Amino acid sequence: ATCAMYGNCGKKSVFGNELPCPVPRSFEPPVLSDETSKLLVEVCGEEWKEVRYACCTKDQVVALRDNLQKAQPLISSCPACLKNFNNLFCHFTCAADQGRFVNITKVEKSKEDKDIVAELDVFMNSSWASEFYDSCKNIKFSATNGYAMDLIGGGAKNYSQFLKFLGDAKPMLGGSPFQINYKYDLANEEKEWQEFNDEVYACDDAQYKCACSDCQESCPHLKPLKDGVCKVGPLPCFSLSVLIFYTICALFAFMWYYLTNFFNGKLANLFTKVGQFSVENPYKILITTVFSIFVFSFIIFQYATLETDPINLWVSKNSEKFKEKEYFDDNFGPFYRTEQIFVVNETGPVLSYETLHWWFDVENFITEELQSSENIGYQDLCFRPTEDSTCVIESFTQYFQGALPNKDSWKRELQECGKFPVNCLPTFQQPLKTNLLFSDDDILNAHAFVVTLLLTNHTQSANRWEERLEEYLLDLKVPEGLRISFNTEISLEKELNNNNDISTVAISYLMMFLYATWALRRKDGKTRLLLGISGLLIVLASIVCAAGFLTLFGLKSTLIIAEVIPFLILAIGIDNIFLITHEYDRNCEQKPEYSIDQKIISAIGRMSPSILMSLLCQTGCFLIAAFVTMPAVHNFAIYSTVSVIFNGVLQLTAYVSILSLYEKRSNYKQITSFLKTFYFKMLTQKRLIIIIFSAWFFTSLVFLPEIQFGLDQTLAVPQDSYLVDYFKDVYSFLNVGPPVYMVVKNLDLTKRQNQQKICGKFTTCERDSLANVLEQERHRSTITEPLANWLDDYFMFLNPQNDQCCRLKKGTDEVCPPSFPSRRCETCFQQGSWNYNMSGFPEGKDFMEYLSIWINAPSDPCPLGGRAPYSTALVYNETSVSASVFRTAHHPLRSQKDFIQAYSDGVRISSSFPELDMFAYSPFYIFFVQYQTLGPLTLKLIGSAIILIFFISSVFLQNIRSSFLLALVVTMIIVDIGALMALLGISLNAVSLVNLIICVGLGVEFCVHIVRSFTVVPSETKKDANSRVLYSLNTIGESVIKGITLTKFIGVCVLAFAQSKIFDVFYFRMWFTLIIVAALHALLFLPALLSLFGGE
Ligand SMILES: *[C@@H]1O[C@H](CO)[C@@H](O[C@@H]2O[C@H](CO)[C@@H](O[C@@H]3O[C@H](CO)[C@@H](O)[C@H](O)[C@@H]3O)[C@H](O)[C@H]2NC(C)=O)[C@H](O)[C@H]1NC(C)=O
Ligand SMILES: *[C@@H]1O[C@H](CO)[C@@H](O[C@@H]2O[C@H](CO)[C@@H](O[C@@H]3O[C@H](CO)[C@@H](O)[C@H](O)[C@@H]3O)[C@H](O)[C@H]2NC(C)=O)[C@H](O)[C@H]1NC(C)=O
Ligand SMILES: CC(C)[C@@H](C)/C=C/[C@@H](C)[C@H]1CC[C@H]2C3=CC=C4C[C@@H](O)CC[C@]4(C)[C@H]3CC[C@]12C
Ligand SMILES: *[C@@H]1O[C@H](CO)[C@@H](O)[C@H](O)[C@H]1NC(C)=O
Ligand SMILES: *[C@@H]1O[C@H](CO)[C@@H](O)[C@H](O)[C@H]1NC(C)=O
Known part of the structure; x- marks a missing residue:
């Protein structure tokens, strides 16, 4: 029994630190005098039993008791960390029976009024300190989702940097103990030889176990092992198969010489009699065609004027994700209109007192907005999580509630709010994370910051307000050394409306017509005077008759067919014109005693089967494209095949007639x-x-x-527009991408079976539970931001030690108001039966009974689980509950391949829960x-x-x-x-x-x-x-x-x-x-x- 300090020598004028004094090794105190009873139960555990001699006074016991009484609510989540933490401080302070402190050097005053130990070292095992830090390096907080390790080690990510946190501080006395390394000639064996370890526990290889949301070991070590096919090879699978299949042929190609029915045959009797019908009364054929043009162009102008401008043309109806999208809107509202504004210092950091003195005027002038149409205000159309809640706005001005200028101490308050967002809450209780509003984490050296404003009211007066906002958002000024960028919902629509002016299409068809007429005019003398005009008019008549005929069945016409159907039908129609005409003009040379009608009948009997063949191939090719999911191509295929058949009938009926009439009204002497x-x-x-x-x-x-x-969509923004700079700023300065909500469709009351599939921060949760699975997916998928689990927060709302909020007076099932700051009301659960052991909380009527009280009051004094965080998070049924959502986000998703990967993740994660009924939604x-x-x-x-x-x-x-x-x-x-x-x-x-x-x-x-x-x-x-x-x-x-x-x-x-x-x-x-x-x-x-x- 050799110690290093004992006696509690010296005192101090104020603050009751009551510091201890040193002692030599040759010293044995009498122990067990009822201090061991107090040193067993309420401090550092019952591991010990009938300890023969200790090395701390009752004074040092109660001081150690109160010190650990302050630190244990910060660490009580992961029990292994708490136990070996207490075991550490007990073996140090009181169990100096085994010498766990050596070479004391500096004593403040030798034996005077100030005789205490300070600035002295400790040896320790590296393996032990590593396993201690590994069991504590990632731990969430109790009252919030913040890192508790971050409170006790700063941004440590290091065990030695966490040891030095314990060196010197305001509470009792700083001794700066920990010095792990003892490389050479430590001491004699068992006489001052000193290494430190007492069988450090962890999350695993221990009878105790922590949570996956807390500990990385408690998560599935079998994180999904198949990982899916990466779908990319260092060798391209298809390309390599093509190469080798051609190469095995490439060897041999050089080594092998190194050694009654006349159905379609005479179908042209039907093409004959149609042509013979076309030359007889051709005027009515042309009259009927030109009148039917009036009929259909009429129909198109008055009826089915809609041009399916909405975005419902790309999405397939009756699909999974569309039904899921409507199910989201009907219960959780629509996705808010987003207005993001960037502010950026090129080459340097943004944050200065001049920039705050600039944004002082802006944050409130945007609640005024240049006197919009009939005085529509942002406060009048904002996003309110509750009707009595204030308008939300994402900007670091809400870290200060708008009360912005604190010239003398703004940097520190801003570092505090960046690292510890709690106690930096805006008018709404919803916290804000720096990555959402800053390009870089260290704000003082951040190149840009994001101010985002959102609305809820989805109709056309909000767009008229945005139309009013842009003109003055352009007229607003800027310093010489600062840059801005902005965007709103109807920006891309207006940029599509901007460069819609394409007279180039008109002059293109002009040049096409001038050439198409100029075909075979001067072969045998001037000819062809206004015959190409007629064929072009019949070809155009094909598409107008098709457009009207299909607007009869109430069919939508996309912007895409406006460029495709003309281009297509012309490309085929003039091609038939030149085939018919040239075949006639060659028949005019062989046997000219054939009258003109027999000339055109012979031409049709030669080549009309080629037209029908091309037509059948094309129309079948277009009907195959009718068995598709989305209507943008479905409506196309119908439009196409019908425009083809209308052209295929008019150019072999109406054009045949106009050809006859043209060549008959002309003498056309052939020479x-x-x-x-x-x-x-x-x-x-x-x-x-x-x-x-x-x-x-x-x-x-x-x-x-x-x-x-x-x-x-980023490519199409025109040159010299206000959005080309915006997407370059998103590519470099925005850290968070699209948000994802995990929605569970229909479950009953907490039966404690269902919840073990969703709970994260608890012990009795499945390995395959929701939050734990999403934690292991989050390391490697497109989703990087942690999720909002209202069940973990609702259950953390009732733990007594972190409650100044949940209170009631007499067990009366009636709470005590937050405007009632008194001790007369006690906690909602017993300080002992708070049931952290298992996933413990009410199951039936009492679960709902406490749930309504949880969202009854917001969280200003007790910053946990207000009405503002989860007001619209769940459509709770009167009897148990209906549905609920759990939001998260994507890493910025800059590339288009990133978008595709983000979706394939959004489909592979939802398929991972065969137990439950859930799905994922992103806009x-x-x-x-x-x-x-x-x-x-x-x-x-x-x-x-x-x-x-x-x-x-x-x-x-x-x-x-x-x-x-x-x-x-x-x-x-x-x-x-x-x-x-x-x-x-x-x-x-x-x-x-x-x-x-x-x-x-x-x-x-x-x-x-x-x-x-x-x-x-x-x-x-x-x-x-x-x-x-x-x-x-x-x-x-x-x-x-x-x-x-x-x-x-x-x-x-x-x-x-x-x-x-x-x-x-x-x-x-x-x-x-x-x-x-x-x-x-x-x-x-x-x-x-x-x-x-x-x-x-
Ligand atoms: C962010 O924007 C500010 C505002 O335009 C700019 O900051 C500039 O930072 C440089 C480098 O620290 C300053 O240069 C220094 O100027 C002093 C004179 O006061 C000179 O004696 C030093 O040797 C040094 O060259 C510069 O003054 C400062 N701008 C202003 C107006 O004070 C810059 O555009 C961005 N910040 C950067 C680049 O760090
Ligand atoms: C946004 O939501 C509201 C829902 O009402 C709409 O904005 C405007 O809301 C005010 C009331 O907050 C309406 O004013 C009231 O109109 C009635 C007649 O309907 C009148 O008797 C009252 O004295 C009062 O003035 C207002 O009609 C309504 N609309 C407009 C254009 O001001 C609006 O419908 C929603 N926004 C969009 C884009 O749909
Ligand atoms: C529309 C999607 C697909 C993509 C493009 C959106 C990107 C931005 C605008 C997204 C990314 C993360 C989003 C985001 C994060 C967090 C919250 C808090 C929540 O309580 C309301 C939504 C809100 C306020 C939204 C706002 C819009 C953000 C900032
Ligand atoms: C303590 O430091 C002394 C030097 O003062 C050194 O000789 C010795 O090895 C160290 N350890 C012990 C226990 O003396
Ligand atoms: C939701 O509540 C209704 C009554 O409001 C009840 O009929 C229904 O069964 C509940 N849904 C369940 C239990 O799935």
């Missing part, structure tokens, strides 16, 4: 190797061009999966459901179309060889466009998907006419494959290139000044790529493939 003819010698290079397009196809098919998915979730299936949907849709093209082409051609060649070319053109999407920065979303469908349609269009002409024309022909290839080019190829050149003129004219970035990305580059790739595959690859196929 008859050019440049287009000179390219017949180039075809001797058969194999080269096919290898070129084969490498073109293989290279495109390898780069095929590098296309990005999505669409960024943007309903918009990104498409991308989870868009890849395979593209593959299914296109491949289905291609195989359907194969079937229909094999039907009309009555042969599979040429039809397969058609299918191979049309497959190839899409692949090449897909890689060219990757290269041209085109994102893959619904918009570009529709345009790829019409790519497939037009690609089909080009090729069908040629491959139909590869069928024999027995009069004046050869069965020689190359010979009818030359036929297909000098007959149809010239007409095809003359329907191509105009569709190229559109691209070039569009590009010159179409400033709409979304139009310039997804429509110019798409279409330009389409016409180029498809013309090169149709004019070059197709003829070489066919001629070399037949070449034998």
Whole structure:
């Protein structure tokens, strides 16, 4: 029994620290004189029993008792930390029986009125101190969600930095003890040899256990081990499979030479009698067409004027996430309109007394707002969690309730509010975290700060107020060294309305018309005077009649069809015009004793089956796109197929009539190797061009999966707008992204079974419980912010030691007011039966009985569980409860791939709870459901179309060889466009998907006419494959290139000044790529493939 200090020598004039004095080792005190009874139960535990000798007085016991009485409510959550904490201080202070302090040096006064030990050291084991700190490094607080370790170690994250926190302080005396390391010649064995450890417990490997919300060990060590397929490989799976499949062929290709029915055959009796019907009474055909135009343009102007401007065109109705979105709105209100304003110092920190003297005027002038329309105020439209609550505003001015200027002491108060947001509460009891309103954590060196204002009232007067707010938000001033940025809900809508001016589209169609008319006019003398005008008017009549006919069935018309349906129907219609006309003008040279009517009947009997074939392939390709989830493409497919069939019937009825009438009112006296003819010698290079397009196809098919998915609303904001700076500020200065709410649909009363699946801060909670699972997901998923668990807070509201709030007078089931500051009312639960052991609280009627009292009063004196935090958090049923939500947030989500990953997390987490009925809601979730299936949907849709093209082409051609060649070319053109999407920065979303469908349609269009002409024309022909290839080019190829050149003129004219970035990305580059790739595959690859196929 050798000690290091004993005697309690010296006293002190005030403050009752009553400090102890040192002593030598050769000293043994008499003990057990009823101090051991007091030293056992109420201080540092019953581990000891009949301890032979101790080293502390009764005075030091009661001083140690009161010291630990102050510190134990701060640590009582995790029992292992509390126990080894008390065991530490007891083995130090009183159990100096075993020498746990050595080499005392400085005593204030040797034996005078001030004889005490100060500034002395202690040895200790590193393993022991590490296991002690590991069991205490992350601990939440009792009255709040703050880190209790942060109260006892600062921003420690270090055991030695936590040891030195214990060195010197205002309470009793600072001794600065802890010095762990003793590397060389400590002392003799058992004589001053001294290491320290007493079997330190932890959360695990111990009969005691803490919570997962507290301790990292209590969480599932089997954090989800399968982790899901990362879906990305250092080797691209599909690309590597493509490479090796081509390479095993690449070896062999060099080593193997290193060694009765006439249904569709004579269907043209129905096309004959229609044409013969078109030339007989053609005037009424033209009259009926031109009058039906008046009828439909009428319908469109008066009826179905709506143009489906709302965002309900992208989202699929009857889907999971849409039903979930409505279920959110009906119970928890709608998502608040957000108005975020950035204030930023470029190259430096923002916070200065001048900036506060500036925002002094701003925070209140925005409660005035430039005398808006009929005096609408922010206080009159704000967000109120309760009707008597004040208007909320997120800004560090609410750390000071608006009472902003404290010139002498603002830095410290702001550091206090940043680290410890409690006791920094605004007019509303809702606290504020720095990451939500600051770019960087250390506020004094933060490059920017975020002031966010939100509203609840979702109709058009709030938007008229925002229209009033912007003009003066632009007219507001700024210092020379400061920057600002801002945004509101209707900003993007107005930026879409801003650059809607595209006269370029009008002049584009102008140039297309001027060329399209100028076709084959001066071959055999001046001709073609106003015949192209008629065909263009009939083509336009097709889309107007379709638009009116489908507004008859009350069908919505998107902005997308306004650019696609004209572009598509023109591209096909003028192509049929040039085929019909040129075939007539060639019949005028062979056997001109055929009258004009027999000229056009013979032309229709030759080529109308090609039109029907192209039409069936396209319409089937468009009906496949009808079996889709979202209506933006569904309405497209209906519009498309119906506009195609209206054009396919008018250009073979009405245009046939106007052709007859035009060539009959003119006398047209007929009297008859050019440049287009000179390219017949180039075809001797058969194999080269096919290898070129084969490498073109293989290279495109390898780069095929590098296309990005999505669409960024941030791109489209026009140049020199007030939002281009805003998104760059969000990319760098905003720390929190979209909020996520976990909603549980329908449960009963707390039966203590259901709650063990949601409780986090307690011992008797499942491993698979909600808060613990979300804690282990939060380390690695898109959600980083901790969650608002009102059940843990509602149960922490009734613990007696941290209650100045829950009180009642006589067990009367009637509480005592918060404006009643008196001790006459006692705690709601017994100081002993507070049931921390298990998840303990009322289950039936008494659970609700205390729940209504919990949200009865706010939390100003007792800052825990007011009405303001969780007023709208749960739609409580009168009998038990209905639903409730638990909010959290995302890490900022800057990229579009981040948005997609955020959603796939929002779907993988909800599928982790087969026990419960829950789901996740974020405003943007309903918009990104498409991308989870868009890849395979593209593959299914296109491949289905291609195989359907194969079937229909094999039907009309009555042969599979040429039809397969058609299918191979049309497959190839899409692949090449897909890689060219990757290269041209085109994102893959619904918009570009529709345009790829019409790519497939037009690609089909080009090729069908040629491959139909590869069928024999027995009069004046050869069965020689190359010979009818030359036929297909000098007959149809010239007409095809003359329907191509105009569709190229559109691209070039569009590009010159179409400033709409979304139009310039997804429509110019798409279409330009389409016409180029498809013309090169149709004019070059197709003829070489066919001629070399037949070449034998
Ligand atoms: C944030 O905005 C403020 C306000 O415009 C700017 O702070 C500037 O910080 C620099 C560097 O600390 C100051 O330079 C110093 O100026 C004194 C003269 O008072 C000179 O003797 C020192 O040697 C040093 O160069 C500068 O004065 C200060 N600006 C003003 C108006 O006082 C800056 O734009 C941002 N803060 C940064 C860059 O730290
Ligand atoms: C925002 O919510 C309120 C819900 O009423 C609407 O704003 C305005 O609210 C005041 C009352 O707070 C209404 O004034 C009252 O109108 C009645 C006639 O209806 C009149 O007899 C009273 O003397 C009083 O003036 C006011 O009508 C109402 N609307 C407007 C335009 O001022 C408003 O409907 C909501 N905002 C939006 C954008 O929907
Ligand atoms: C709309 C979503 C999808 C995305 C874009 C939103 C981003 C910002 C605006 C989000 C991110 C976190 C959000 C957030 C965090 C916390 C709270 C407290 C809560 O009691 C009301 C909502 C409120 C006040 C909102 C405001 C809007 C914020 C700041
Ligand atoms: C204490 O310090 C002295 C030096 O004063 C040193 O010689 C000794 O080894 C240290 N430990 C003990 C117990 O004396
Ligand atoms: C909710 O309360 C109603 C009465 O207001 C009760 O009929 C109903 O059963 C409750 N819902 C439950 C228990 O799921």
